[PDB]
Amino acid sequence: SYAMCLNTFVLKKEVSETQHGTILIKVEYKGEDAPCKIPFSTEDGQGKAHNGRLITANPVVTKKEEPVNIEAEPPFGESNIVIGIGDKALKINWYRKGSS
């Protein structure tokens, strides 16, 4: 239902990985257009799309002043999780291993 957030996000703490190989990301939003949907995508090193998905999966900013906890399942190996759009988007590099 919500439109996309068009502004910038800030990372509030160290990123971390769960047992299921999902990543936990805590962000704060710097725009005035909340409530809005958090734009989420994944990229390779040279900037082309990749194979990641949200677990939260309707992650939204309700109040600008209030952090949002995102859980995401990035692709295997190295990827860049991108939160927000364009330049200024937060980009988090991560390497996901599967089981030996």
UniProtKB/Swiss-Prot annotation:
It is a multi-pass membrane protein. N-glycosylated. It is found in: Virion membrane; Host endoplasmic reticulum membrane. Disulfide bonds join C5-C36. Binds to host cell surface receptor and mediates fusion between viral and cellular membranes. Envelope protein is synthesized in the endoplasmic reticulum in the form of heterodimer with protein prM. They play a role in virion budding in the ER, and the newly formed immature particle is covered with 60 spikes composed of heterodimer between precursor prM and envelope protein E. The virion is transported to the Golgi apparatus where the low pH causes dissociation of PrM-E heterodimers and formation of E homodimers. prM-E cleavage is inefficient, and many virions are only partially matured. Homodimer; in the endoplasmic reticulum and Golgi. Interacts with protein prM. Interacts with non-structural protein 1. This is Envelope protein E. It comes from Dengue virus type 3 (strain Philippines/H87/1956).
